[PDB]
């Protein structure tokens, strides 16, 4: 069979805190001797609607930061801010911290969110970054400061720290260097995102692990050129796919037999036929949050 | 609403691989037990149709590899209990968590943890079918990955993976080593019964939905649990039991709709079809009412 899975959450949970500040309390992110957490932790509801926090920043103290991991105290020595994020110097190291590495995903790519509330790990699932930068999750009050991550060979990358839910249901978060991805920014206001697409490549993907899992259905005896597809493609609000992107379906073409541009032949078909009643991998649309990759380590290790 | 998965963390403390021979395999390490399938005392030539007491007889401490990570604990007693091993070892596991072993229904849904060579590569969630099949994603060396629920730090252990049935869904059993199913731990092609849809599920999806504000199918009318049932058969929908009834008194409460009114409205929409519910013409079967409290209203 062929599932949304995430990786394995342990190394991740043991990092996970609590920080509070005045009334606002939030998950942070504990790794040697730093906590990394949204910053509004230190704002209140009317600050919020513009918040200066340079300004709001210098007038707090180490002791106006209140972390715990589990029932145990943690003492803040230091503070700064990076960018959308506080890093609070606390005078404890975390042994449970993986080896570690921030990184910035691109859209397109996949990770593993934390649900977490009150500094206690609650959920897990994967999302994949929209090329609108907005993120499909499921958060609730309290979810800021979880955060999303891969892992490879026991280094955990982290990715994405929880911040924002917009008045469509989606996320926006940061990266952790405190940058936002998309054009959100941390205030108390309504913020829509620019109109999404459909990962194409990642379509592609899934359809190669379908023929994998022994579904074929949708294949057909026809081929396209790469412009002809990316033609239909753009049609339907679908990424144009790059010879890059051709290359990187190597490996999931090479297994099948089955030539890219025969697979863009079968999902331009799918498009302008539409799926009429029928089902690939158990779904009854085209999937795109799963990429090459999270297809190859799925069905072959 | 989305499937996700308990943090796996307290399960992944307890993973280690087993091995017989060249056979590898994953196992459940909790306090000085190490819990594994029996299949690995198996050669690639004696799964067939094996005498598991006989070829256990031929075994001893000395015949098992037990390893977190590369690092050997020692077997000091082993027995078997239905298709289980019970492999007791000289250390008890520091990471082990507070646990029970429950023996989970149809219709019940649980974190799998898939594993190879001891360690964990993957978590995500799965629904008991009434078939008594789970629709997994498991490859070559998954056999001993276990499915498990979180509730309050207390681990409920509920399945242990052995097979994958050639239609491509899986089997396995409970802690206690007994099959869910009338599935049996040998190399054969095994067939599952004719599935059925979850009642309990798609129920507790029309009460998420009500919690949406989606409530268009709901009706003036009422049904008895038997007339319910009945219908519900001619659809290839499970009866509901009155632990059914029961486990939705919560969802029944919030929305102020009783469980015999939203059979009432089920029953009308098998006899007469569907029109959206919570943005698809597909009832989802796959979240419990519990699933559905979880993400409604968050653990907070």
Same mark, same amino acid.
């Given at each position: 069979?062929?599932?949304?899975?995430?990786?394995?959450?342990?190394?991740?949970?043991?990092?996970?805190?609590?920080?509070?500040?005045?009334?606002?309390?939030?998950?942070?992110?504990?790794?040697?001797?730093?906590?990394?957490?949204?910053?509004?932790?230190?704002?209140?509801?009317?600050?919020?609607?513009?918040?200066?926090?340079?300004?709001?920043?210098?007038?707090?103290?180490?002791?106006?930061?209140?972390?715990?991991?589990?029932?145990?105290?943690?003492?803040?020595?230091?503070?700064?801010?990076?960018?959308?994020?506080?890093?609070?110097?606390?005078?404890?190291?975390?042994?449970?911290?993986?080896?570690?590495?921030?990184?910035?995903?691109?859209?397109?790519?996949?990770?593993?969110?934390?649900?977490?509330?009150?500094?206690?790990?609650?959920?897990?699932?994967?999302?994949?970054?929209?090329?609108?930068?907005?993120?499909?999750?499921?958060?609730?009050?309290?979810?800021?400061?979880?955060?999303?991550?891969?892992?490879?060979?026991?280094?955990?990358?982290?990715?994405?720290?929880?911040?924002?839910?917009?008045?469509?249901?989606?996320?926006?978060?940061?990266?952790?260097?405190?940058?936002?991805?998309?054009?959100?920014?941390?205030?108390?206001?309504?913020?829509?995102?620019?109109?999404?697409?459909?990962?194409?490549?990642?379509?592609? $993907?899934? @359809?190669?692990?379908?023929?994998? =899992? #022994?579904?074929?259905?949708?294949?057909?005896?026809?081929? !396209?050129? *790469?412009? &002809?597809?990316?033609?239909?493609?753009?049609?339907?609000?679908?990424?144009?796919?790059?010879?890059?992107?051709?290359?990187?379906?190597?490996?999931?073409?090479?297994?099948?037999?089955?030539?890219?541009?025969?697979?863009? $032949?079968? @999902?331009?078909?799918?498009?302008? =036929? #539409?799926?009429?009643?029928?089902?690939?991998?158990?779904? !009854?649309? *085209?999937? &795109?949050?799963?990429?090459?990759?999270?297809?190859?380590?799925?069905?072959?290790?």
């Amino acid at each position: 069979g062929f599932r949304k899975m995430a990786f394995p959450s342990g190394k991740v949970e043991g990092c996970m805190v609590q920080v509070t500040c005045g009334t606002t309390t939030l998950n942070g992110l504990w790794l040697d001797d730093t906590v990394y957490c949204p910053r509004h932790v230190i704002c209140t509801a009317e600050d919020m609607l513009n918040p200066n926090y340079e300004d709001l920043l210098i007038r707090k103290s180490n002791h106006s930061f209140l972390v715990q991991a589990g029932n145990v105290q943690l003492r803040v020595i230091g503070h700064s801010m990076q960018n959308c994020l506080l890093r609070l110097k606390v005078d404890t190291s975390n042994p449970k911290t993986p080896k570690y590495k921030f990184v910035r995903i691109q859209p397109g790519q996949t990770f593993s969110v934390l649900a977490c509330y009150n500094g206690s790990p609650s959920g897990v699932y994967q999302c994949a970054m929209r090329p609108n930068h907005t993120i499909k999750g499921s958060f609730l009050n309290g979810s800021c400061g979880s955060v999303g991550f891969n892992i490879d060979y026991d280094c955990v990358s982290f990715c994405y720290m929880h911040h924002m839910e917009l008045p469509t249901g989606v996320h926006a978060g940061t990266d952790l260097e405190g940058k936002f991805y998309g054009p959100f920014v941390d205030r108390q206001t309504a913020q829509a995102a620019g109109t999404d697409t459909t990962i194409t490549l990642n379509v592609l $993907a899934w @359809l190669y692990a379908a023929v994998i =899992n #022994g579904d074929r259905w949708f294949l057909n005896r026809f081929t !396209t050129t *790469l412009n &002809d597809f990316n033609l239909v493609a753009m049609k339907y609000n679908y990424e144009p796919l790059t010879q890059d992107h051709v290359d990187i379906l190597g490996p999931l073409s090479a297994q099948t037999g089955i030539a890219v541009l025969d697979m863009c $032949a079968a @999902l331009k078909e799918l498009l302008q =036929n #539409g799926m009429n009643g029928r089902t690939i991998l158990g779904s !009854t649309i *085209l999937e &795109d949050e799963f990429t090459p990759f999270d297809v190859v380590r799925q069905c072959s290790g």
